[PDB]
Structures are given as structure tokens and as C-alpha cells.
From a paper:
Here we determined the cryo-electron microscopy structure of the Mycobacterium smegmatis hydrogenase Huc and investigated its mechanism. Huc is a highly efficient oxygen-insensitive enzyme that couples oxidation of atmospheric H2 to the hydrogenation of the respiratory electron carrier menaquinone. Huc uses narrow hydrophobic gas channels to selectively bind atmospheric H2 at the expense of O2, and 3 [3Fe–4S] clusters modulate the properties of the enzyme so that atmospheric H2 oxidation is energetically feasible. The Huc catalytic subunits form an octameric 833 kDa complex around a membrane-associated stalk, which transports and reduces menaquinone 94 Å from the membrane.
Out of the 188 amino acids of HucM, only residues 20–79 could be modelled into the cryo-EM density maps, with diffuse density corresponding to the remaining C-terminal region of HucM forming the stalk-like protrusion. This processing showed that the C-terminal region of HucM forms a tube connecting the main body of the Huc oligomer to the membrane. These α-helices are amphipathic, with the hydrophobic face pointing inwards, lining the tube entirely with hydrophobic residues. Interaction of the tube with the phospholipid head groups of the membrane is facilitated by an outward-facing helix at the tube terminus containing arginine, lysine and tryptophan residues. The conduit for menaquinone entry to and exit from the hydrophobic chamber is probably provided by the membrane-associated Huc stalk. Through the scaffolding protein HucM, the Huc complex can extract menaquinone from the membrane and transport it 94 Å to the electron acceptor site of the enzyme.
Author numbering:
A (entry chain A): 4 to 516
B (entry chain T), E (entry chain R): 20 to 64
C (entry chain B), D (entry chain D): 2 to 323
Write the structure that this text describes.
């Protein structure tokens, strides 16, 4: 059965999903990013800092991430100096945007599908409906409402959220005051207490972060009624009951570009020094092995994308030349998403899943420096039960406590008397690579400044990694392979396709830009 | 071409009318600049 | 009051800003104010054919459509087909045509929808335009003469993104019987928000008054106004950004970021051409090319010289201190 | 960090304002920030001898007293006995002596406690004074040389009442290890709040810049600045009232009420003498008696004339429209 | 063409004489505008 689902909403943009279904199981899948704005085209010839204004507009929910990586692209291109306070503010704001994204996405975009009639036979279905029904769910309302708090912190430092451009080469535009920091701390603590710990965890962030194995997580669910009946405990139990742990596996290979620089280690941003300075470590996890991320290994294939091109291009030489979707479909192209691939030795240019799960796998890599995220939890989960909708979601949710703790510490780390900005030299020429981990994963800018203008500007977003179509080798993108194997109880409401696509927290406006 | 765009403005009736009126009183402009030149070269005096 | 919120060439920032709503928050707006959110691409439960059923019922008049909110640009490329924005089996522009023709009120939220915004920046690959404007030029996609069934033009809630209150308070006004209190300016923006300037309530207006310039970002923004060195469009931009603070916390200008004039239809101004980003274009290195709204360069510069002479000492020192 | 909050000649407005705290709210401040509120007359559970036991333990050093917050004036009448303020078996001033001598930090919240405030208005029947000030004159009840055990003078959080953030953010700073970030001005006010002026962020500064006066209350405040006709002390008053809005909503000046300069030690200014309430005292009917801080009548007036002549049209029209 | 209208007005003896006298003192005009530019870029000083 060929099933074309249009729209598949709650993916922050325009997504259609075509699936071949045999015996109630998806056997092949095509993700079709359906809306194109062409910001890379627009940025060409613009002011070298135009990215700081344009790139946040790639996406409402993760524009702060775009800003972060665009700023760092300029910082590397212009060989700027980043005062530690500026690095801290950038980290805080990136993480706060992610902390907003986590509940906002979980309740508003993902968890309402848990109320699908396909689960009516579950013993937990009534509770799932009570908690996660759209707009009236007892977990939905506070989760969504409180999701605005972390970006209040963002606004304290950046003026507003979404759509500040306050991260600039050489630091940040803002000069936090004492009350700024104290209020940011108060907002963060209130959000942590009222949503993260009270509602999501039913325990302290510290208690959750003590979970180092999948068995630890199950014991945590059963440990007491607070954790058992928390949104996290209920979600885990619901997933195990209704089978969200049984599909959406995907590629099983992961890309994290990392983000959150240790301020002392990235005072002078360079492409080469980026990985060592990361707190949230970069890392590629492919074929069960850890690899260092290298942006040089990134190509974008447009074979099945609505763009002209005949070979994968490293984004420094990237091109965004749209083809008319009618013609492209005549050529087998089906998506405005490019197909980002990563050259892994012994594997070729493979698709890599990006996102919190990719980050957790990267955090499980050996040889973490002291400043770096060293977390074996999702290595253990991956080895125990493997990837799935549930495990992907749990990675996303696991970042909540971890990032909250990091943000709280960074707010403590701010040295308010110290500089927030080192005026850079706006060089007429430069090649910049800025990367971050937006909520949904590796977000990267490759910028080429020439003649004091943007010569090239290539954005590769995490959902482009995940949802990008088949490459020249017809290798399905991570979301496409995750869709393959998904059960389809009801083709009229193929909610499992939504579960898989949304478990990646897909953002289609980011996918295409 | 920018230069060709200034020639386009010079093909606009209102711009042309004003430029013609300027050329009509160009003698007065010339005499005022000559008067200023004179005053400057007699500024020591 | 049924609400159908569609996204064209959008980044969903207006939706995300909207989700930051407080007093009312978004959930209370959707539930407790009688605003039946039929669907929203970021929030609607329905997918696929169920969602399309909702859309088609709205478009054909099978069910009433009181408010059609459109976010993002109306994408017309390629070649006016709109296929760079395919939504629910149609070019999004066709949905826009049908639903704008069906709605009692049409609200364009965000510059993209109002005026074309960032996607309409040259070279405008998506053929983006606003609902009733293309930048300042009235008409956009729906034409200058478009009126919704309540007789209103497209209500333009500009901004990039719009502040949540700019839409939520309008929605509350509509829901509380105060639609008649809503007056629109020449850009169809609610005058309750867009008679003020961004500068109105800016923490740096005293520095502006005394022509004290912020000189640098970061700690340099502990003093000064951003107009002179950072291209702040505050005094040329209608908005309540400093009256109604963003995220209930701040505003770009308060934080030290120049207002980019995003509520204005030309946004991004000068199409972010080289030398125009976070810079004040000046004539002869000292006269701003653009002076505040309603002033002329002569008076503005004379008053600026007088103010520089009269400037008190505190206006020359840090004020947003730790 | 133990906190003992006492009220002398107070109206409890600072407590009520404090209870309006958001980010942190008062409950989260008291519970989740490690601030052990030992007692507060409006909130403490203990009464009678149990409360007195708490007070005496703090006064005699039996239990640590980290922050002594004092609200209200130190009442010394009659005849320096302080018996117009008898609290828990002693004149309140005696409690003040003991607890201020015991506390690590002493915080006077509100003008009454900081400077004497309204009760210290002539004829001052209660013999009211501030902790370390009587109006602008340093020394108040505790003497100019009083220092708490952490070496600080009385931290004056002025206002009538103080805005909740003016105290809560200080308390958070103390609780989060940022006490060293707190700098005090010459009136011992936190400079993080009191380097700005009330005017800083006022929605009417553009009208001020162009010397466009609000002419009347009510709808008359849809335009204009209140300085010229309503005695707005905004430009002479240090406060973040327009930076950090009251009740997260507004400020007097935004709302159309003149700033009464309540964060200033002279408040109420001119002791509310006849003709000084909601009026600008003027010389020769045109020149304000008091000009903005750091300005001089001649340069102010010259700049004011220049601003009037160059005024844009919008500055002469309603801007805070419905 | 209005640009040729003014090219024919540039063939006027009196208009030509005045334009030539303007070009004779163009140095003074240049220096006064340079002086104004200088004064403007030193207006802060
Ligand atoms: N998070 C996020 Fe948006 C996506 N995909 C970017 O980057
Ligand atoms: S917020 Fe986004 S939808 Fe358009 S108005 Fe700005 S690019
Ligand atoms: S007063 Fe404020 S709005 Fe801009 S022009 Fe100056 S920073
Ligand atoms: S850029 Fe826009 S959000 Fe307000 S501060 Fe300026 S009008
Ligand atoms: S609020 Fe009340 S306690 Fe004193 S400072 Fe004002 S009269
Ligand atoms: S600018 Fe505002 S603070 Fe008072 S003096 Fe005018 S109303
Ligand atoms: S009276 Fe006081 S509360 Fe603020 S507006 Fe003036 S300083
Ligand atoms: Mg790209
Ligand atoms: Ni996104």
C-alpha cells in the first residue's frame, strides 16, 4: 500500500511522508520537505554579518541555535577573540533555547500523539489522554506554558526570543547586569522546580542524572510513586506498554557536532580547535564505533533533492540552485531537503542521525576531558535496547536535567565585571565554520566571506541530516530508515509515521531554509 | 548602469524642467561664485 | 471563534513567539477565550487526510472560519505556481486564496506574511510576498482591495517575529467583544501597538536625547544609544517593543542590540547589503542618512549639536551597570 | 541565610510589593534560595512569646542573623523613647539597635526605613527616621558609621514601596554567591537598580526630548511627558521603574502618573506642600524650578527651546492610543 | 529627449559662458564643500 501523508504536521514546517506498507509495516519511506525559502541564496552578496539576522529566521524554535553557530562562523572566519563571559552567555542562551524546545516540543508536538486511538486498549491510555491531550492535557498545559521560561532567560541576555541577533563576532552585544543574572537564575530554578523536577522527573535533576544504565532508568521509574507517575516515568511506561520502544530505530549511526564551548578553551575560535573546546562533545557514532567529528567530512547530496547538482559538495563549496519540483520529480527528486552525508572511513558517505540521541552517544565516547560531557547512559541504552522512538525521546528529555545543570553553573560562572565583547576586525576575506547542537542536533554554517561580502553561505541543519532524502547511492536518510519497519495500524491515521518523524523533533523550516 | 540611471532622471519632465530653470539662472550662480572668488582673493584686503 | 493558522514561507518564529504568550498564555487563549484553534501546523493534532478535511471544510465554507492566521510568506515561485510551498496537496498560495476568501478576519502574523519579510529579500528565490503587501507596496498576494468577510483588510501583525501580545491581545479583543476597538494604521497594523516607536520606552532614549552613542557591543552597551553607531532603527520603527517588553524581560535595544526595524515593511532594511548590518549609514561620516521619523536632517542635526553641548555628565557614563 | 524582617513605622507596602515578587516569587525565594525567613510580622507563624524567643535569640546572638530587613521608620517619639512603636515588649528602635548590631547584613526596605519617608514628613509626630539616613542626611537612627557584621552599611532599597525585584534580586545575589557584585551608591542603594533614572525607559522620554508636555490627566496622558505640568521627578530620580516594570506591567510614568521621586531620600519632595502635588513648580511660569539631574537651567532651557522648534509632528499627538 | 533639451541649452552662448565661469571657480566650490565635509567630520570635536 502506497500511503502519502500530507501534511505530517507538528514538525515545524511542511512535511509530506510517502510510505510503502506491506503487511501493516512500512517497507520504504520518502520524506518530502515541501517548502523552500532559499536563505542561502539570499545571503549571497549580503553583509558578512547578515547571517546573524537571516539565519535565526531559518527557524523560530531553534533560531537562537542558528544565531549561535552563525556567530561562531563569523568568529572563526574573522579569527575573533571571545571573552569568556561572551562564551558563557552564548552557551546559556543556546542551552536555554534547547530547554525551551524540550518541553514545548514534547508536549505540543510529540506527546499529543500518545492520545491516539491506536492506544485506546492500553491500560495507561486514559492517563495518557488526561496528561497529553492537546491544549487540555494536565501535563500539556503546564509543560507548554512553562516552556517559555528558559527563553525568558534568553531574552534577558539577548533582548528577546525568538529573533535576537545579539551573538556577534567577538562576543555578545549585551552587557548583563547583576539583576539580569539573578533573574535568569531565578527563572531557571523556577522552571526546573516547576516543570523539570516536579512534572517531568518527579525527582531532582541530580537523581535523574544518577541513571547510568537502562536498568538504572527502569529502576528509577519503579523507585517511588513520584518518579513512577512523573511525565518521564509515565512516558517510559507508556512507551514500553504501547511499543514505542519497538520501532523508529533508524540508522543507528549518529552525528553530533557538539556545542557549549568551555570559555577558556575557545577564546579564539578556530575550526581546528573547536572539538577540544566543546563541553557537549562532538562525535560520530558509526558502525558501533566512535569517530571524531570533522566538518571536512560533510557533504551535501542533491540527487533526490530539488536542487541542481551532480556530486556531493562540501558546504564550503556548497550550492543551492533550486530546480522546479515538477522537473525534479521527473528526475526522481522528491524533497527540498538536501541529503547531508558524512564520510566515515570504511563506510563511505553515510547518513548520520542527528539530535539528542546523537549527542548522548557522543557523550558516551571515551577520553572525555574534564570540561566535557561524559555520560555512559545512552551507550548502555543503545547496547541494551537500541534506538527507537522511545530511546530517541528519552535522549531528548535526558538533556533537560543535564543542560539545566550546565546553565545554572554557567550563570554562576559569569564574571559580571569582565568583558562580554572584543571588537573584532571585520576582515574582507574569511572562511568560517560555526557549529552548534541545536535542540534537534548538529547545526552548522559554512561561510565564505569575500570582498567584505558573503561569497558563500551554506547551512546544514540537524533535520536536514535526519530527514534529507536518499543520496546518490539511494541510501535512505535517518528518518526515512527510521520510518521503515514502523507498524501502521491505521492508514487513515498513520500516527506511527508521526511518532517516528516527531521523535527526531523534525524541523522542516530548518531542513530546507 | 548607474550613469545611465542619471541620464534616465535627466529624461524625466520635472527633473528636466528644474535643470533648465537652473541653467536659466546659471549666470546668477556664476556671478555669485565669481563674487565669492573675488571676496576670497580680496580677503587679505 | 474558529481559528485556522497556516504557515507559508515561515520559520515558525511567530508561532514560537505566540507560544511565549503570557496574559493570556497560549493554552488559556486557545481554551478559555472561546477561540477554537481548528488547526496549526505546529500544534494541530490532525495529519494527512484528516487535516486536509479540516482545511477543505474551511475553504469551501462547510464550516465557519472566523480567523485565518497566516504566518510566513505567500510563496509564488516557481513561475507563479507556488510549488516551492506545497501544503496538503496544493500550493500554499491556493490555500491562502481560498481561506482568506473564507475567513471573517485574516491576520498576517510576522513580516513574512504581512510584507514578504526576509524571504522576499532579493533575489527572492521563493517568489515570496506578503498577504496584502510586498514590502511597503500595498497589494501583496491578495491585492490591495482584499477584504475579509468582516470587511477588514488583512490585519498585519508585523515583527520578525511578532511579539506574542501583538496577536494575543488582538485575539482577546476579538474574543471579548472589542473588535471595534481595534484601529489599524496605513500598514494595517494595530495602532494599539504600532503608534509608538521601538524607541518609545527604550532605556537609551536619554542617551539619544543627548546624542551619546554606544560605541561598542558588550560592556560598551552599558551606556549610550545604538542609533549613531549601530544603525538602531528604533526612532524610525513603529512598535511597542520597549512598551511591552519581549518575553516580559527586555527588548533588543535595552539589551544593546539595535532595533532592525522589523515591524516596518521594508525589513530587512537595505536588504542587509554590505555595510548596513549593525551600522549607521552616515553622510560625511557624521550625519545619519536616516533621521528619526518626522524630523529633517537640518533640525535633527542642529538639535543634536545643541544636545551634545547640553549633555549632562551621567549621559556620558555607564548607566546599565552590574 | 537567616532573614529577620521587622516593621517599624511601616505601612507594610514594601512587604506587599515584595509578595508581588516574580522570578523569583516570594515563596520560591523563601524556600528554594536557602533564605530562612525566621519571622516577618505579616508572614511569620509565631506569635507572642514564641516570636519573642526568635527575636531575642537573634538579638543576643543565640542564633545567627544573616539578613535583618527593616521596613518602616525607626520611631523614636515620644521624647526619644520610641513608645509610639512598641513591638514584642520593647520600643521597636531598641529591637532595631540589637538586631542591626547582630545581623551580617542590614537591609532597609522602603523610604521609611531608608530615609524616614512619609512618616518623617513634618511635623514628624512619630519622631520617625531611617536606619542610616534622615532624608538625604546620612546617619539616621544607627549613625553614619554603622556597619553590619559583613562590613556593609545599611543596604537602602528605597521606594515607597520598593519594587519586589529591588530586594528579591539583592537577596538572590546574596544567596547565589554574588554579594560581591552588589555595589551601593552614596545613598547605599544598589547601583544595579539606582544608576538609571525613573525616566530611563519611560515611554514618554521622546516627548520629554521634544519638550511636549502632557496637558491633562486621563486621555491627556495618551501623549506628552509629565515633567512640565505634573511635576514628574523622573529625570531627577534614580530608579529602574521604567527598566524593571512594576507588577511586570507598567510604571507610574507610563500610566500617566508623575514620578514622585520616591526612591530619592527627600521623598515626599517638598513635604507635599500646597501647590507641589502633581504640579511642576516653575519660575516665571516657564522655567521649571528643578531641571533634570546633571543639567543647568540655561543649557536645559536652551536645548528645550531648540527641541520645541524642531519637534516632529508625532511628538505633538497621541501615541498611547486605544 | 529632455537630456538633449539641456544639450541644446548647453549650446546657448550665455548659459555656456556662465557654466564656464562656474568651472573656472570649481576649485573654490570644491574647497568650500571639502571645508564643509571637514567641519562635519570634526563636528563632534
Ligand atoms: N534544533 C533545531 Fe533547527 C533543526 N533541525 C536547527 O539547527
Ligand atoms: S519570525 Fe519567521 S515566519 Fe517570517 S516574520 Fe520572521 S522569518
Ligand atoms: S533610544 Fe533606543 S530605540 Fe535605538 S535609537 Fe537609541 S537605542
Ligand atoms: S527589530 Fe523588531 S522586535 Fe522590536 S526592537 Fe525592532 S521592532
Ligand atoms: S510603602 Fe510603606 S513602609 Fe514606608 S516606604 Fe512607603 S510608607
Ligand atoms: S520622560 Fe517619563 S519619567 Fe517623567 S519626566 Fe517625562 S514622564
Ligand atoms: S515615585 Fe517611585 S516607584 Fe518609581 S516611578 Fe518614581 S521612583
Ligand atoms: Mg543548507
Ligand atoms: Ni528549527
Amino acid at each position: 500500500l502506497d500511503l502519502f501523508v500530507s501534511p505530517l504536521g507538528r514538525v515545524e514546517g511542511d512535511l509530506d511522508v510517502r510510505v510503502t506498507i506491506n503487511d501493516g509495516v512500512v517497507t520504504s519511506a520518502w520524506t518530502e520537505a515541501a517548502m523552500f525559502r532559499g536563505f542561502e541564496i539570499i545571503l549571497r552578496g549580503k553583509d558578512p554579518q547578515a547571517g546573524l539576522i537571516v539565519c535565526p529566521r531559518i527557524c523560530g524554535i531553534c533560531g537562537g541555535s542558528h544565531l549561535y553557530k552563525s556567530a561562531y562562523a563569523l568568529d572563526t572566519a574573522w579569527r575573533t577573540h571571545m571573552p569568556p563571559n561572551a562564551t558563557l552567555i552564548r552557551n546559556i542562551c543556546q542551552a536555554c533555547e534547547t530547554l525551551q524546545s524540550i518541553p514545548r516540543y514534547f508536549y505540543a508536538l510529540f506527546a499529543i500523539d500518545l492520545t491516539n486511538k491506536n492506544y485506546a486498549k492500553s491500560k495507561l491510555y486514559d492517563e495518557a489522554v488526561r496528561r497529553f491531550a492537546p491544549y487540555v492535557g494536565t501535563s500539556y498545559q503546564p509543560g507548554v506554558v512553562l516552556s517559555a521560561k528558559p527563553v525568558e532567560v534568553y531574552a534577558i541576555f539577548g533582548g528577546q526570543w525568538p529573533x535576537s541577533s545579539f551573538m556577534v563576532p567577538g562576543g555578545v552585544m549585551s552587557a548583563p547586569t547583576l539583576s539580569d543574572v539573578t533573574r535568569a537564575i531565578a527563572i531557571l530554578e523556577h522552571w526546573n522546580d516547576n516543570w523539570l523536577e516536579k512534572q517531568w522527573l518527579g525527582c531532582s535533576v541530580d537523581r535523574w542524572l544518577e541513571n547510568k544504565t537502562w536498568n538504572d532508568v527502569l529502576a528509577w521509574v519503579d523507585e517511588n510513586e513520584s518518579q513512577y507517575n512523573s511525565d518521564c516515568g509515565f512516558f517510559i511506561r507508556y512507551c514500553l506498554d504501547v511499543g514505542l520502544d519497538k520501532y523508529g530505530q533508524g540508522v543507528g549511526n549518529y552525528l553530533a557536532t557538539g556545542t557549549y564551548f568551555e570559555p577558556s578553551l575557545y577564546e579564539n575560535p578556530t575550526i581546528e580547535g573547536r572539538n577540544a573546546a566543546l563541553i557537549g562533545r562532538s562525535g560520530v557514532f558509526a558502525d558501533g564505533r566512535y569517530f571524531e567529528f570533522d566538518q571536512a567530512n560533510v557533504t551535501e547530496d542533491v540527487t533526490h533533492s530539488f536542487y541542481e547538482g551532480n556530486r556531493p559538495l562540501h558546504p564550503f563549496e556548497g550550492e543551492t540552485i533550486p530546480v522546479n519540483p515538477e522537473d525534479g520529480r521527473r528526475q526522481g527528486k522528491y524533497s527540498w531537503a538536501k541529503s547531508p552525508r558524512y564520510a566515515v572511513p570504511g563506510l563511505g558517505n553515510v547518513p548520520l542521525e542527528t539530535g539528542p540521541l546523537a549527542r548522548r552517544m557522543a557523550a558516551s565516547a571515551p577520553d572525555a576531558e574534564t570540561h566535557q560531557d561524559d555520560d555512559p547512559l545512552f551507550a548502555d541504552i543503545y547496547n541494551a535496547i537500541g534506538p527507537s522512538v522511545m530511546v530517541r525521546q528519552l535522549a531528548r528529555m535526558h538533556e533537560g536535567p543535564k543542560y539545566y545543570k550546565w546553565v545554572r553553573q554557567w550563570l554562576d560562572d559569569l564574571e559580571l565585571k569582565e568583558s562580554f565583547y572584543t571588537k573584532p576586525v571585520e576582515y574582507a576575506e574569511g572562511k568560517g565554520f560555526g557549529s552548534t547542537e541545536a535542540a534537534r542536533g548538529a547545526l552548522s554554517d559554512w561561510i565564505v566571506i569575500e570582498d567584505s561580502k558573503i561569497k558563500n553561505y551554506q547551512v546544514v541543519t540537524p533535520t536536514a541530516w535526519n530527514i534529507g532524502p536518499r543520496d546518490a547511492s539511494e541510501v535512505l536518510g535517518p528518518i526515512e530508515q527510521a520510518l521503515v519497519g514502523s507498524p501502521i495500524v491505521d492508514a487513515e491515521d498513520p500516527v506511527e509515521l508521526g511518532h517516528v518523524a516527531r521523535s527526531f523533533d523534525s524541523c522542516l523550516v530548518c531542513t530546507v531554509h | 548602469s548607474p550613469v545611465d540611471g542619471i541620464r534616465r532622471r535627466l529624461d524625466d519632465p520635472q527633473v528636466a524642467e528644474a535643470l533648465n530653470s537652473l541653467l536659466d539662472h546659471a549666470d546668477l550662480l556664476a556671478v555669485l561664485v565669481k563674487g565669492l572668488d573675488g571676496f576670497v582673493r580680496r580677503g587679505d584686503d | 471563534a474558529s481559528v485556522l493558522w497556516f504557515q507559508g514561507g515561515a520559520c515558525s518564529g511567530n508561532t514560537m513567539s505566540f507560544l511565549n504568550a503570557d496574559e493570556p498564555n497560549v493554552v488559556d487563549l486557545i481554551v478559555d477565550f472561546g477561540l477554537d484553534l481548528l488547526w496549526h501546523p505546529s500544534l494541530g493534532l490532525e495529519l494527512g487526510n484528516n487535516a486536509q478535511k479540516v482545511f477543505w471544510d474551511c475553504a469551501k465554507g462547510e464550516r465557519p472560519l472566523d480567523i485565518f492566521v497566516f504566518e510566513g510568506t505567500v510563496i509564488e515561485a516557481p513561475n507563479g505556481t507556488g510549488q516551492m510551498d506545497m501544503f496538503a496537496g496544493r500550493p500554499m498560495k491556493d490555500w491562502v486564496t481560498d481561506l482568506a476568501g473564507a475567513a471573517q478576519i485574516v491576520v498576517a502574523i510576522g513580516d513574512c506574511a504581512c510584507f514578504g519579510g526576509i524571504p522576499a529579500m532579493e533575489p527572492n528565490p521563493s517568489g515570496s510576498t506578503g498577504l496584502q503587501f510586498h514590502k511597503r507596496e500595498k497589494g501583496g498576494f491578495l491585492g490591495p482591495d482584499f477584504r475579509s468577510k468582516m470587511g477588514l483588510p488583512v490585519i498585519n501583525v508585523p515583527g520578525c517575529p511578532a511579539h506574542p501580545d501583538w496577536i494575543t491581545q488582538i485575539l482577546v479583543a476579538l474574543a471579548t467583544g472589542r473588535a471595534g476597538d481595534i484601529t489599524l494604521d496605513d500598514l494595517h497594523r494595530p495602532e494599539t501597538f504600532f503608534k509608538t516607536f521601538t524607541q518609545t520606552g527604550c532605556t537609551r532614549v536619554q542617551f539619544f536625547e543627548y546624542k551619546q552613542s554606544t560605541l561598542s557591543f558588550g560592556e560598551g552597551t552599558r551606556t549610550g544609544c545604538l542609533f549613531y553607531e549601530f544603525g538602531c532603527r528604533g526612532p524610525m520603527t513603529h512598535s511597542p517593543c520597549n512598551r511591552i517588553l519581549w518575553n516580559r524581560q527586555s527588548s533588543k535595544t535595552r539589551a544593546g542590540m539595535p532595533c532592525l526595524g522589523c515591524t516596518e515593511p521594508e525589513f530587512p532594511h537595505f536588504d542587509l547589503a554590505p555595510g548596513t548590518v549593525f551600522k549607521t549609514q552616515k553622510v560625511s561620516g557624521m550625519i545619519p542618512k536616516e533621521v528619526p521619523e518626522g524630523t529633517d536632517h537640518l533640525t535633527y542635526m542642529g538639535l543634536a549639536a545643541a544636545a551634545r553641548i547640553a549633555a549632562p555628565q551621567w549621559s556620558k557614563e555607564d548607566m546599565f551597570v552590574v
